[PDB]
Amino acid sequence: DLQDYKAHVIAKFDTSVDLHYDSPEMKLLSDAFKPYQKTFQPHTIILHGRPGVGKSALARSIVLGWAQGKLFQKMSFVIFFSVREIKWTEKSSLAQLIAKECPDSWDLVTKIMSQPERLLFVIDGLDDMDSVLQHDDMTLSRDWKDEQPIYILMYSLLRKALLPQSFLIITTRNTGLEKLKSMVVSPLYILVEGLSASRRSQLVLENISNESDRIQVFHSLIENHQLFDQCQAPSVCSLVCEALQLQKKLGKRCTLPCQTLTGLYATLVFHQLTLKRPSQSALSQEEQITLVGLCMMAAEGVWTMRSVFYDDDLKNYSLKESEILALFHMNILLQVGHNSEQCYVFSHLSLQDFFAALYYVLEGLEEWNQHFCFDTRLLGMKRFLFGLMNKDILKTLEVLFEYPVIPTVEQKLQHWVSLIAQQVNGTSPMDTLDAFYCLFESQDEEFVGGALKRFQEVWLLINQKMDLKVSSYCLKHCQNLKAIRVDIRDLLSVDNTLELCPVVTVQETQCKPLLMEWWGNFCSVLGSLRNLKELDLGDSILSQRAMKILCLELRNQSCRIQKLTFKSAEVVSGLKHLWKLLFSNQNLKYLNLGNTPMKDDDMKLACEALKHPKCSVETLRLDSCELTIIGYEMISTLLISTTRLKCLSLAKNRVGVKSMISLGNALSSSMCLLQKLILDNCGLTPASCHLLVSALFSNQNLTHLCLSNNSLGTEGVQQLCQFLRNPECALQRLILNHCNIVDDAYGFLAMRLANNTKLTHLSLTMNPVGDGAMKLLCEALKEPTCYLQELELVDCQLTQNCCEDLACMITTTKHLKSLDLGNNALGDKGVITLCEGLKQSSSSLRRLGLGACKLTSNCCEALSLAISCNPHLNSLNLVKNDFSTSGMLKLCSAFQCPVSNLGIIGLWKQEYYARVRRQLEEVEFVKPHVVIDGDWYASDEDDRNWWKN
Amino acid sequence: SLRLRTRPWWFPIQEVSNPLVLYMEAWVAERVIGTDQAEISEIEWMCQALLTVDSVNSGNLAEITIFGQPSAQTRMKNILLNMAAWHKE
Amino acid sequence: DPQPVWDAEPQFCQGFLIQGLWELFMDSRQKNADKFLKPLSWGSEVLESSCNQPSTALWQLERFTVPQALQKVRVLKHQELLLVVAVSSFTRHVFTCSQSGIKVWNLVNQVAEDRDPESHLKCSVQDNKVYLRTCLLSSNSRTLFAGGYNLPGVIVWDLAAPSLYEKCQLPCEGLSCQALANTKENMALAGFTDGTVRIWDLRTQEIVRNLKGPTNSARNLVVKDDNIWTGGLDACLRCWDLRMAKVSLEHLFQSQIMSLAHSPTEDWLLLGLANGQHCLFNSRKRDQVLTVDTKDNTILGLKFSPNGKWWASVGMGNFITVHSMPTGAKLFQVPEVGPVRCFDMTENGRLIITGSRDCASVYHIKY
C-alpha cells in the first residue's frame, strides 16, 4: 500500500515546476544527513531564516523529491505536518494526527513494529507555539496512543522521548528560536538567505523617481541596514518597488517623504483607502469601528506573541472578512486552512507591526471601547511608532477622521529621549546612537528640535556610512552641546579605495566616493555650530585625505573651538595641514599633541607657524614625543622670540645635557615670559637639575613649577631653597610628587616656609618622611607668617605619633584650608585624638582626606561628634576603610543633623547592607545638595589637576 | 533565489543581522580563497568570523560576505586584503 | 541578624521605554533624574570612563593596575545549587554546573534577567542515578572536561566543531572526580577521592602513570611546568615530580587546606586554610611560609589576577573581598545572600562571576 501513499502524496503537493530542481544548494541538504566527523552522525536538522523567504517551498520540494526519487532513498517513509493550520487546544493522539495525514490506517501497525530505525518527519511552522508554553511544568509523554492536547505531544516528540532514533527536519523563524534551542538535542543548524546583494541593488535602482535627487534618495534607501535586511524576501522588495512607482506617478500630490519604510507603507495603505471613496471625504462610523478593531487586534497579537488569529478572535472584536475586503481591496488578512476551521494571517509580519503602531495614535480620539465585546520582537513596532509622528501622516489622519489628532504618547517619547541626556557620569554611546536612529526615522523638525535641548555632551562611535548621515542630520538641532568625541577606528584607515558594486556605475560621473562626501558633510556640520568649543578626536586613525578635509573645513569663520586634542590618534600624515590650520583660526588657545612622533621638518614647520602674529594659543603639550637635540634648539629659539605661549610641557621624554644647557640659557633671559612649566617623567640627572635651578635663579616670571618623577639631590633642593627665598620670585605652587627628598632637605624647607608669603600649594607625595621632619614642618607652618593653603601628603611614611601635633596645628592655625592624608598608617587612636582637636573648630578648614588610614569601628563616635557641630567643614573622604553596622548607623545619624554643611562626601555605597542603604537614601532625600560618590578626586573646585591633563 | 549555508553552534544569532559586503576581482578571489574546507574553517575559528564567496556575477567581480562584530570584521578583512595583495605580487 | 534586600538592578533605558509602552495598552482597555547603568556592549566591554588618581605612574608602570569597585549588570537563573563556573571570554560564553547538569549560556543577549540557556547537557538519564561535581576548560577554549560521582569516566566534549557532541570517555570505574587539571603538552590529569592522581593521554586515551597517596590528599591540584602540588584534609602540602615519580617536598600546616592558586608571573603560591588565614609560599626558594590575614569565616575560593597584582576570596561569610598582592591589605567588599561557593574571572580581567544558592550573578570591574 506504500505505492498508493506515494501516488497520493505526489498528487496532493504539486505547486512548483521550475522552482524545484537539482540545484547545488539541495545536494548540501541531501548530504547533510551524513557523519561529518566519524564519531558524530546528526539526527535533527533545524532550518532558520528571515520570515519571508520560501522555506515551506523547501520542505514541500523535499517531500516531493522523496516521493519521486533521487533525493532520499534509504528513507522508507516521510510524514508532513503543518501546525499553523490546525488548532492546538483539543485533545488528540499521535495516531489521530497520523490518520488525518495518512489516508490508510492499516499500514501504521506494521510501520511502527520495525521501521522506527528509519522514519523521517518534516515539520512546518512551530514558531507560533511560543505563547502556549506555560513554563511551569509539563509531563513528558513516553508512548503514543495517548489522549492529550497536541502541544504536549509536540514537546514530547521534540525531546526524542516519544519515537526515538527517528530523524526530524524543522522549519522555524529567527526570532522564534529563543525557546527552541534548549529543547532539541545536538542539532545541526542551516541558514537560508533571500536574494543576493547586486540583484537587490539593481531592483531598487530601476524603481527610483530620478527627479534630479536620485543619488541621495537611492543611497539613503540602500545603506539603511534595517530596511535592507527585511528587503531579503521577494515580497517586501516587490512592495517597496510598487510604493516607489506609486509615488512617482502621483508625484505632486504626495507630500509624504520617500526615505523610510514608514512613508512607503503609509503611502500604499492610505492610497488604497482613498481609492474606495468616490470623493475626498470622511470615513463613516462603521468604517471607523472596523479600522479601530483591526488595528487593536494587531496590537494585542504583537504583544502576546500570536500570529494565527482564530475566528473567535475575529468575533470578540466584532469584525468580518467581507468588510475588510470591501474597505481595503488589498491583499490584507488572507485566509488559510483546509478543514472546517479557518485561520487568518496577515500577508506579512511587517503589516501587523505597522497596524499595531497605528493603534496608539487613534486610541484617545474618542471612546471606542463601547462597541467592542471583550525585546527583539518589538523592534519593528517601536520603529514604526516613532516614524508615525510625522506631521503629514497626522494631517491625512485628521482629514480622514474629521478630528484633530494630538497623540498622548508624544510627550512620553520626548521625555524618554530627554532622560538619556541628563546622566550623572556621562552618556552611554549605544543609547545615544539608538535615539539618533529613531529620531532620523521621524523626519519632523519640531519633534527633533524639542527632543534635543538638554544634551550638553556627546560621544559617538562611527563605523558605518549611515551613522555619519544620521549624526550629521540630527546634530544641527543640538544647540546646547559643548563637547564632542568621535571614535572612527577603521572606516578611514585605508587611504585609497576605488571600486564599483554593479557591473556598470550607478552614476555617470562621480569622480569621488560617497564616503568622502558624507565625511565632509559631518565635518562641516561640526564646524558650523556656535556653542561648541571643545573638540576631541578620541581613538581614531586618520589618513592624509581625511585630515586635509577636516583642516580645510575647520578654517571657516564661524567655528569657535578653543581646545584641540590628539592624544590617542595616529595623524602623522596630516601634520603639515595641522600646522597650516594652526595660524589661520584665532579662536583656539589650547593644543594637546601627545604621543605623536615628530621629525625635524615637522618641528621646524610647527615652530615657524607658532611664531606668526596671527596665532593665539596659550597652552601647548608635547609629552611622550620623540625629540632630537635640534628639536630642543628650535624649542629654545621659539621660546626666546616674541610668542603668546604661557604653558609648556615636556613630559615623558629623555633630556640631554646639551638640551638642558640650551634650555637654561634660553629661559634665563628676562625676555622669556612663561607662567607654568611641567617636566615630569624625564631623565634628569642631579647635575642637570642643578643647572636647571641655577638657570631658574634669575627668572621672575614663572608661577607654577613641576619636577615630578625625577632624581633630586640635597644640593638641588638647597639651590631651590636659595632661589625661592629671595624676593620677586612669584612662585605659588610646588610639585615634587616623586623626587626623593630626605633628611636636611625638610629642615631647609621648614626654615623657608616659616616666614614666606606668595606660596599657596605644596605637595610632598611619595616621599620618605617620618615623624621627625613632619615635626619641623608643622612647627614652621604654625607661625602666623605663612600663607600656604593646601598640603598633600598622600604616600608619606607617617605614623600615629604626631597626631597630637596635628591636632594642635589644626586648632591653632589660621590660613591653610586643605589637608590630605592618603596612605599613612593613622590607626584609631591617632584619628580619635585628631578629631578631639578638630571638633573644637578654631580654624576654617574645608577639605579633609582620611582615605586608606586603617580605620575600625571604634573611632565612629568621635568622628560623628566632630562632624555634628562644625559648620565650616565642606568636604570629606572615607573610602578604603571598614565599618561595622552600628558605627555606620551612628555616622549616618550624624549626617542628618541640621547644623552640618557637608557638600561632597566620598563613599562607595554598594558595599553595605540594606539598612545602611536606606539611611543613606534618606540622607540624600532630606538634603538636596549632598553628593555621595566614590570618585572623590574628580571634584575640581580650583584648578588642582592642572599638570595631569 | 535560495542560498544554503551551515552555521556553527558557537556563532550567536544576534550578530548575523548585519553583513559586510566587499567586491574585488574574481580570478584573484578564486585563487586566494582556495578549495578545501579545513583551513577555511580554522581561519573562521581564529578570526571568529564566517565568510562565504559567491561568483554568480557575470563579470570579473565576485561577492564576499563577512559576518561578525565590527572588530572581528575589520581584522578578518585586513587578513584577506593582505593575503590578496601578497598573492597578486 | 542583618538581611540583604534584593532589587531589580538594571532597568536600562530600553526596558524603561518598553515598560512605558506596555503600561499604556493595559491602561486604555480598562473601562470594559533616574539612574541607569551603562549597557554591556557586544558582550565584551562597557565603554565607561576611568577613575582619577592623586598622582602619575612611572614610565614602566603602565599595565599594573588595581580595581576599585564592582557593579552588578545581570543575573543568571539556574534552578539547582551552583557548584562550579567558567567563562572563557574568548568565545563570550559562560558554563555553569550543578548536581544534575551543565547549562551553557551566552553574554551577547541584552536581558535584565536570563532564563533561557543555549543548551542543556545532562548525563543523569544515561545511567540509573549519576551526579556531577566539577568542570574544567582548556586555555584555548577547544575542549571541556567534566566528572561525576557514579560516572564511568570523565566525559570530553568538543567545542570547535559545527556541532556539540561527546568525544571520549577516559575510563575510571569507581572513583569520584573531586578535582581536575590540564597541561600544555596535550595530556590530562585528575585526582580522585582516595588520593590517586592518574594521567591519561588526550590523543589516544591510554593510561600513562598512576600516583598514589593517603586518603583525601588530592582534594586540590595545581600543576607547573614539571611539578605537581597536592594537599587536602590531611593538612599537608607535597610536591610530586612526573619524571622521578616520588615525593620531593612536604610541609605541615595547622588546619585543613581548602584551596590553592598560583601566580601567573611570580613564584608565589596562595593557600587558604580553614580558619581564614591566607598564606604565601615560595615555589622556587621553598624557604618559609608567612601569614598575612585573619578572618572569622572559612575560605572556599582563591584566584590571581592575569597580571598577578591582586587576588580575590569568597567564602561562608556573606562577603566577596579583594586584597592587594604586595602585603595582603583589604581593599573593599560586596555583600551577598548566602554561602558563596564558586566564582571565576575572565582572561582580560574585565568581569567576575559569582554564584551563591541558585543565581550566577555577573559583576563588572571598575578600574
Swiss-Prot record, chain A:
What does the UniProt record report as the effect of altering residue 856 to I in this chain? Decreased interaction with TLE6
Alphabetic keyword roster: ATP-binding, Cytoplasm, Cytoplasmic vesicle, Golgi apparatus, Leucine-rich repeat, Mitochondrion, Nucleotide-binding, Nucleus, Repeat
Localization (cell): Cytoplasm; Cytoplasmic vesicle, Secretory vesicle, Cortical granule; Mitochondrion; Nucleus, Nucleolus
Q: In what residue span(s) does the NACHT domain sit? A: 43-365
Q: What is the effect of changing residue 442 to I?
A: Impaired formation of the subcortical maternal complex (SCMC)
Q: Does the keyword RNA-binding apply?
A: no
The entry summarizes the disruption phenotype as follows:
Mice appear phenotypically normal with no apparent defects in ovarian development, oocyte maturation or ovulation. Cortical granules are scattered throughout the cytoplasm in oocytes and ovulated eggs. Reduced abundance of intact MYH9/MyoIIA and MYO5A, the dense cortical actin scaffold remained present prior to exocytosis. Increase in polyspermy in the perivitelline space resulting from a decrease in efficacy of the zona pellucida block. Increase in multiple pronuclei and delay in cortical granule exocytosis and ZP2 cleavage.
Give residues annotated as binding ATP.
49-56
Q: What is its main location?
A: cytoplasm
Q: Where are the LRR repeats?
A: 587-608, 616-637, 644-664, 673-692, 701-721, 730-750, 758-779, 787-808, 815-836, 844-865, 872-893
List the Gene Ontology MF annotations in alphabetical order: ATP binding; structural constituent of cytoplasmic lattice
The consequence of residue 83 to G is:
In strain: A/J
Which domain of life does the protein's organism represent? Answer: Eukaryota
Signals that turn on the gene: (Microbial infection) Reduced by T.gondii in the testes and uterus.
One BP term from GO? regulation of RNA stability
What modifications does the entry list under PTM / processing?
Answer: Phosphorylated by PRKCE.
A single GO CC term for this protein reads: Golgi apparatus
* Family the entry assigns: Belongs to the NLRP family.
- Mind telling me what this protein is named? NACHT, LRR and PYD domains-containing protein 5
The uppermost taxa in this organism's lineage are: Eukaryota, Metazoa, Chordata, Craniata, Vertebrata
> What is the gene called?
Nlrp5
From Swiss-Prot, chain B:
Q: What happens when the gene is disrupted?
A: Embryonic death at 2.5 dpc. Progression from embryonic 1- to 2-cell stage delayed 6-8 hours. Less than 20% of the embryos progress beyond 2-cell stage. Embryos form unequal sized blastomeres due to smaller, dysmorphic, and displaced mitotic spindles resulting in asymmetric division. Decrease in thickness of subcortical F-actin in zygotes, thickening of F-actin bundles in the cytoplasm and loss of F-actin cytoplasmic lattices. Decrease in CFL1/Cofilin-1 expression in the subcortex and diffused distribution in the cytoplasm of zygotes.
Please give the chief subcellular localization of this protein. Answer: cytoplasm
Domain spans labelled KH: 19-80
- Please give the positions of the paired cysteines in each disulfide bond: none
Q: Which UniProt keywords apply?
A: Cytoplasm, Nucleus
Induction of this protein: by what?
Induced by etoposide.
Q: What is known of its domains?
A: Contains an atypical KH domain with amino acid changes at critical sites, suggesting that it may not bind RNA.
What does the function comment of this entry state?
Answer: Component of the subcortical maternal complex (SCMC), a multiprotein complex that plays a key role in early embryonic development. The SCMC complex is a structural constituent of cytoplasmic lattices, which consist in fibrous structures found in the cytoplasm of oocytes and preimplantation embryos. They are required to store maternal proteins critical for embryonic development, such as proteins that control epigenetic reprogramming of the preimplantation embryo, and prevent their degradation or activation.
Q: Which family does it belong to?
A: Belongs to the KHDC1 family.
Protein known as: Oocyte-expressed protein homolog
Q: Which organism is it from?
A: Mus musculus
Q: What is the lineage of its organism?
A: Eukaryota, Metazoa, Chordata, Craniata, Vertebrata
Swiss-Prot record, chain C:
Protein name, UniProt field: Transducin-like enhancer protein 6
Q: Which family does it belong to?
A: Belongs to the WD repeat Groucho/TLE family.
* Example GO molecular function: structural constituent of cytoplasmic lattice
Q: How does it assemble?
A: Homodimers. Component of the subcortical maternal complex (SCMC), at least composed of NLRP5, KHDC3, OOEP, and TLE6. Within the complex, interacts with NLRP5, KHDC3 and OOEP. The SCMC may facilitate translocation of its components between the nuclear and cytoplasmic compartments. As part of the SCMC interacts with the SCMC-associated protein ZBED3. As part of the SCMC interacts with the SCMC-associated protein NLRP4F. As part of the SCMC interacts with the SCMC-associated protein CFL1/Cofilin-1. Interacts with FOXG1/BF-1; the interaction inhibits TLE1 interaction with FOXG1/BF-1.
Instruction: Please tell me whether the keyword Ion transport is annotated for this protein.
Output: no
The keyword Nucleus is assigned to this record = yes
One GO location term (cellular component): subcortical maternal complex
What is the reported tissue distribution? Expressed in spermatogonia (at protein level). Expressed predominantly in ovaries, where it is restricted to growing oocytes, with greatest levels in fully grown oocytes. Expressed predominantly in testis, heart, lung, liver and muscle, and at very low levels in the brain, spleen and kidney. Expressed in bone marrow-derived macrophages and osteoclasts.
Induction of its expression: Induced by E2A-HLF, a chimeric transcription factor containing the transactivation domain of E2A linked to the DNA-binding and dimerization domain of HLF. Induced during TNFSF11/RANKL-induced osteoclast differentiation.
- What organism is recorded for this protein? Mus musculus
Free-text note regarding domains = Contrary to other WD repeat Groucho/TLE family members, does not contain any identifiable Q, GP, CcN or SP domains. Only the C-terminal WD-repeat domain is conserved.
Map the WD repeats onto residue numbers: 33-69, 77-115, 127-167, 170-210, 213-250, 252-291, 294-333, 335-366
